Swiss-Prot record, chain A:
A Gene Ontology BP annotation from the UniProt entry: diaminopimelate biosynthetic process
Comment on bound cofactor: Binds 2 Zn(2+) or Co(2+) ions per subunit.
Subunit structure: Homodimer.
Organism field: Neisseria meningitidis serogroup B (strain ATCC BAA-335 / MC58)
Function: Catalyzes the hydrolysis of N-succinyl-L,L-diaminopimelic acid (SDAP), forming succinate and LL-2,6-diaminopimelate (DAP), an intermediate involved in the bacterial biosynthesis of lysine and meso-diaminopimelic acid, an essential component of bacterial cell walls.
Assigned keywords, A-Z: Amino-acid biosynthesis, Cobalt, Diaminopimelate biosynthesis, Hydrolase, Lysine biosynthesis, Metal-binding, Zinc
Gene Ontology MF, one: succinyl-diaminopimelate desuccinylase activity
EC nos: 3.5.1.18
The keyword Transmembrane helix appears for this protein: no
Name recorded for this polypeptide: Succinyl-diaminopimelate desuccinylase
Location of the active site: 68, 133 (proton acceptor)
UniProtKB/Swiss-Prot annotation, chain B:
Catalytic reaction list: N-succinyl-(2S,6S)-2,6-diaminopimelate + H2O = (2S,6S)-2,6-diaminopimelate + succinate
Cofactor(s) demanded: Zn(2+); Co(2+)
SUPFAM superfamilies for the chain: Bacterial exopeptidase dimerisation domain (SSF55031), Zn-dependent exopeptidases (SSF53187)
Enzyme Commission (EC) number: 3.5.1.18
Record gene name: dapE
GO MF term set: acetylornithine deacetylase activity; cobalt ion binding; succinyl-diaminopimelate desuccinylase activity; zinc ion binding
Pfam family, any one: Peptidase_M20
Protein name: Succinyl-diaminopimelate desuccinylase
CDD domains, alphabetized: M20_DapE_proteobac
């Protein structure tokens, strides 16, 4: 089949930089209407969202994704234009080729094939599609999930089509993701000429014992699904530039990518306790961009593995590593949720691409998941 | 009580000798002291004027050292009286160079005149070593004069550097030495990457952490009766460009030692490298050393200066090595014993720079007392 490729190219050619959908959701609704998918627009702010649903009864199998793509940067740095999808060297190049329009196209064609085979299949098939997953994402999937929860329209199995493969399609699926908690610390000292240290307080020096403690701390020990919670400093700056001045303050930016084994509250409490135990005097701003989520190994992960083994001939590893996805919202309404897509090697980069041969394989995988959950 | 010191101070202050311009101060000094047997040698090095004035041919040689340059005044409207129109007001003499250090130079000239008058066949020799660039780059000042004196084996037994040393009352402190300064520019190497993949990055903040702590906690030496412990301080630390989801690739750290004679440049470097290397830090380190510590232990010169201050000022002087440095760091190489002694340093390089009027004849009587205890 070449329908998946054709659809992917059609989507890629629409310059849907966040939050502009460029009529991608209209295209998808109108294509799926033929096969009984009802369309419901759920627009909020400047974001377009759509809930497409075939069927009325459980089990409900949902594909979730996003039509928006990240900015291209200057087109002249690309080998071919980012919204003029190109085949070259066994790859399809364009912004959104990996993240994540090829997945969308592959699921749509999987539904078409599946429903042609099984027009009386049990349950429901839905798509949950946003035009802002790559930006602030405050008027996107999160708001759709709230709508669905409030009306008791829950999901049994959800596949988020983000790119998850490492090197071969199907080598990796995500069954959860870390959350993210960030701190902006400003340690206070007292500026002065360096040769008169008794008139100054060096915030580098006051911070040092806490810095070491922080970087050596074991926050948790991870578990079967998650690595240990990870603390990293991104930025540190203190001084005026003069080499004969003791700084008056020191700024430190840090982040946690945390598992289910730690909480936002507990991490913050422990950081303050380490600072306070060393007598550090400080200001601290905290922000949290998302919460961890997890699906235990079970039916969904087993079905996905089986479909991958049939199509791709490889064992799919479960993982929670990397960044996050809109699964962080959807898990609240989904009994089981995974992420499954092509290689993420080129996401958000110039000359983003997917291997051509992986395109019909990914569609086949999705169709195999549908057949196992609904046929 | 003599009024000559104050009048000479005013004469000097009135000359706007912003570095390196002498404005004839050294001509004035040479001409005046020629009357009492000081021979003059001018040592012009580039843009800088220097003089070696000397009376006598034998040891002991007592030298006063100083500088006729002054720092800039800044906007002149910000002064309560014009910086080169010395003024007497509220018990103080105001003007640029009143404290740093034209009063000292005046007071030593008039001490020479009074001392020589009372002791016309004193032993030894008296000298002045004066530069027009102590405040600027000073590449052509005292250090080059010292090199000429050392090359010709014209050495000094006792030197008084007339920089202001009083903290409050004239005579409260004498400097008998200074710290040296050793600076490092440390670049800690890591490997940039997205923060969510730390195993693919190397975070230089994290690799440096244990070494940072050890460096900041280190006791480099115990001090001694003349110096505080060697002092290590981090002046700057910078890594990253503001992205909160990126592990930076390198970290810049600048630090400094103000170190005594209890530690050496090489020894401090070695210990720093050893601490970095024990913790497995990967780095580049560029060193700079702007000067070396120097010291005159308590002995004749410090004794005489304390005796003179007790007699003139009624103050029990203490010895110090604190603060920055002076041209003594150069002169000590040719002077067996060297101190710094002058009036209050409270106002140096500031607007409305001044000295107490009553301190002026006192300082000159102290200098004369030193001459008499060393040479009579
Ligand atoms: Zn995506
Ligand atoms: Zn993305
Ligand atoms: Zn000065
Ligand atoms: Zn000076
Ligand atoms: Zn006498």
């Amino acid at each position: 089949e070449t329908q998946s490729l054709e659809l992917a190219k059609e989507l890629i050619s629409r310059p849907s930089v966040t939050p502009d959908d460029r009529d991608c959701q209209k295209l998808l609704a109108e294509r799926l209407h033929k096969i009984g998918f009802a369309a419901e627009e759920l627009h909020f702010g400047d974001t377009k969202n759509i809930w497409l649903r075939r069927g009325t009864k459980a089990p409900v199998v949902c594909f979730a994704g996003h039509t928006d793509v990240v900015p291209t940067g200057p087109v002249e740095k690309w080998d071919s234009p980012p919204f003029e999808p190109a085949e070259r060297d066994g790859r399809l190049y364009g912004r959104g080729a990996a993240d994540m329009k090829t997945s969308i196209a592959c699921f749509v064609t999987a539904c078409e094939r599946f429903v042609a085979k099984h027009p009386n299949h049990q349950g429901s098939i839905a798509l949950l599609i946003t035009s802002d997953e790559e930006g602030d994402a405050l008027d996107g999937t999160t708001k759709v999930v709230d709508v669905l929860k409030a009306r008791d329209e829950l999901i049994d199995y959800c596949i988020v089509g983000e790119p998850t493969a490492v090197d071969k399609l199907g080598d990796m699926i995500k069954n959860g993701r870390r959350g993210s908690l960030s701190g902006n610390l400003t340690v206070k000292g007292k500026q002065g000429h360096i040769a008169y240290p008794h008139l100054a307080i060096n915030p580098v020096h006051t911070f040092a014992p806490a810095l070491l403690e922080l970087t050596q701390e074991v926050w948790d020990e991870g578990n079967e699904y998650f690595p240990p919670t990870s603390f990293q400093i991104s930025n540190i700056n203190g001084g005026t530039g003069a080499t004969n001045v003791i700084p008056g303050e020191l700024n430190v930016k840090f982040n946690f990518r945390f598992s289910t084994e730690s909480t936002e509250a507990g991490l913050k409490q422990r950081v303050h306790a380490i600072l306070d135990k060393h007598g550090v005097q400080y200001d601290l701003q905290w922000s949290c961009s998302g919460q961890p989520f997890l699906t235990q190994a079970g039916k969904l992960t087993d079905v996905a593995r089986a479909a991958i083994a049939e199509t791709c001939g490889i064992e799919a590893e479960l993982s929670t590593t990397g960044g996050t996805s809109d699964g962080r919202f959807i898990k609240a309404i989904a009994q089981e949720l995974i992420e499954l897509g092509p290689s993420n090697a080129t996401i958000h980069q110039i000359n983003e691409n997917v291997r051509l041969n992986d395109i019909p394989k990914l569609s086949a995988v999705y169709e195999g998941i549908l057949a196992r959950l609904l046929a």
